[PDB]
Write a protein that binds this ligand. Sequence first.
Ligand SMILES: O=C(O)c1cccc(O[C@H]2O[C@H](CO)[C@H](O)[C@H](O)[C@H]2O)c1
Ligand SMILES: O=C(O)c1cccc(O[C@H]2O[C@H](CO)[C@H](O)[C@H](O)[C@H]2O)c1
Ligand SMILES: O=C(O)c1cccc(O[C@H]2O[C@H](CO)[C@H](O)[C@H](O)[C@H]2O)c1
Ligand code: GLA
Ligand code: GLA
Lengths: 103, 103, 103, 103, 103
Amino acid sequence: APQTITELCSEYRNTQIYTINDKILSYTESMAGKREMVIITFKSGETFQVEVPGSQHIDSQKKAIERMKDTLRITYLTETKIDKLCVWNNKTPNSIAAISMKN
Amino acid sequence: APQTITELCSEYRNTQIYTINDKILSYTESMAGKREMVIITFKSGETFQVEVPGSQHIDSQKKAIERMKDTLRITYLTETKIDKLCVWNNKTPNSIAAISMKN
Amino acid sequence: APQTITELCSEYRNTQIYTINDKILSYTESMAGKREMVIITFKSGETFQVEVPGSQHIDSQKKAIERMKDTLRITYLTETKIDKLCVWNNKTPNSIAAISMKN
Amino acid sequence: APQTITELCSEYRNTQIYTINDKILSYTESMAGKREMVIITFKSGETFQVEVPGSQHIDSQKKAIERMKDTLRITYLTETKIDKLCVWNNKTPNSIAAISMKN
Amino acid sequence: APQTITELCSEYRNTQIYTINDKILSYTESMAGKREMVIITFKSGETFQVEVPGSQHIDSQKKAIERMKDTLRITYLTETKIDKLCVWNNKTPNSIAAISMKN
Ligand SMILES: O=C(O)c1cccc(O[C@H]2O[C@H](CO)[C@H](O)[C@H](O)[C@H]2O)c1
Ligand SMILES: O=C(O)c1cccc(O[C@H]2O[C@H](CO)[C@H](O)[C@H](O)[C@H]2O)c1
Ligand SMILES: O=C(O)c1cccc(O[C@H]2O[C@H](CO)[C@H](O)[C@H](O)[C@H]2O)c1
Ligand SMILES: OC[C@H]1O[C@H](O)[C@H](O)[C@@H](O)[C@H]1O
Ligand SMILES: OC[C@H]1O[C@H](O)[C@H](O)[C@@H](O)[C@H]1O
């Protein structure tokens, strides 16, 4: 298995690493139908989503999507610095595939 | 996908944005049959609900309804300021579609 | 839907509101067979349970019973003040239907 | 239903209350197959388990076993003092049936 | 049942104890398909994973894998010191079987 977020991210096409090195500025959560998602922003203005679960996801990703949203909320609330995001860049806002944090 | 709670809110009929800019003043949770819901209030006097799951909701909203209640509870306990609420105004009290928090 | 805990409580038979205006004094949780329940007490001497799930509950209450136990635990741990409890008075100890918190 | 951990523990024939009055010293968690369990210790040296699920349990205990492990972790992390443990003392380590905490 | 992580770790082939005695340096979480996993690192240079669920896991391990990831997140966020890890050494990076914390 990969040993770093960059190694993992490189296994996928249409992805890139953002080096965030910052805490989340805003957290947005929606339960509206067909928009069941989370959006985060940083003081850089950069904005990222956890996508609504769809047919682009395999069954094993369903729990992992829910976990990713749990992680972003608690990351927001604790003011924890995010190090990198691995994101798909074929989505607007770019879509999170993985996150890393260091202290 | 939308980039902000206002953009997302505007995709739905019968909604409006409340700019709260404040922590939750009271949190109410019911496990009484047919009233399995959460109600929050603010110092300003406003009251909002997370509706009981019902036939107006689509399957994808089930998990998101539960997440929203989770979010409201930890937001309350941590005295986290809510920025905006996207609510449906055809319900009494108005019904939460989305929330945002800024730091 | 109701706007307050008292409104909600009054929709049900065999209920009453206790005004607690205090943090939980003690929290007890059991995984013992037939006694899978939570008990809370207050310095006033007042004791309440979340009932063991049973045939008196409907399916929409299953998640909500688990949520209520979750809420009592974290409310205890954080020394959060409880405003009111809606309880069923045809159980001993009285059984929690709904809870509100407010400082 | 019981109103205290003592009353509850008295309904079982191989149980014992351990008066702990202390925070958890160590927390151990395993996901190893057939050893999916939690072990806690205290400075007194006293060691306790949440048993692996099996035929010593009835179905109603399954969610409660997961809850109890959730409780021990957050109790450990928050340095929360445990008052009492009701345990089955026919197991090594003694097996947790219920927990109480007071402040 | 085992009374310590050391005893437990000894019941498995291809495992060893790592004495960590430190907080986690970095946390990585992926929801990318076929890489739904968590990676942790320490200042010692060691890297460990919670494996992607797979045919090597038995049904009783599926909730325990999710729990372990939950534990690693909150341990990271709270700067909690890890005592030992029981890991499988037939995986790269080595795969977490059990964790102990004291502190
Ligand atoms: O999500 C939509 O596309 C939608 C379409 C038509 C009505 C609508 O709102 C109703 O359902 C929501 C919950 O999804 C809420 O209860 C509103 O009060 C309803 O009007 C949403
Ligand atoms: O929720 C109702 O409309 C209802 C109907 C009949 C009985 C009832 O209360 C009983 O169940 C609650 C749990 O939902 C509690 O155990 C009471 O003690 C029971 O009487 C509610
Ligand atoms: O003594 C009793 O009344 C009693 C009832 C049900 C189970 C029980 O203990 C056994 O099961 C628990 C877990 O439910 C635990 O493993 C004990 O070690 C078992 O003896 C006692
Ligand atoms: O697994 C989710 C992933 O699925 C595909 O790879 C898409 O191209 C991405 O944009 C993303 O949605
Ligand atoms: O239970 C998980 C465990 O399963 C097997 O025994 C493998 O050999 C280990 O590498 C580990 O993956």
